[PDB]
Design a protein around this ligand. Structure first.
Ligand SMILES: [Zn+2]
Ligand SMILES: [Zn+2]
Lengths: 60, 9
């Protein structure tokens, strides 16, 4: 695993990792955090039916 | 929703 980071990185609001290759991401329209689709359990197909995504934290 | 798919290697 690489040491250090990319200063121009986006971190998943759930797992806290960087973006990798061929990953599906989704953004909360309220807090504007990004999430691995795998981490919030949303597929591209499902996300197609989502008008405005609201993350678990904002949904409380 | 605001989504994105990253590229391959
Ligand atoms: Zn949110
Ligand atoms: Zn994640």
């Amino acid at each position: 695993g690489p040491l250090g980071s990319d200063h121009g990185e986006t971190l998943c609001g759930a797992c806290g990792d960087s973006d990798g290759a061929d990953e599906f991401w989704i953004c909360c329209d309220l807090c504007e955090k990004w999430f691995h689709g795998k981490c919030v359990k949303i597929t591209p197909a499902r996300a197609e039916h989502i008008k405005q995504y609201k993350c678990p934290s904002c949904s409380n | 929703a605001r989504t994105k798919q990253t590229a391959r290697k």
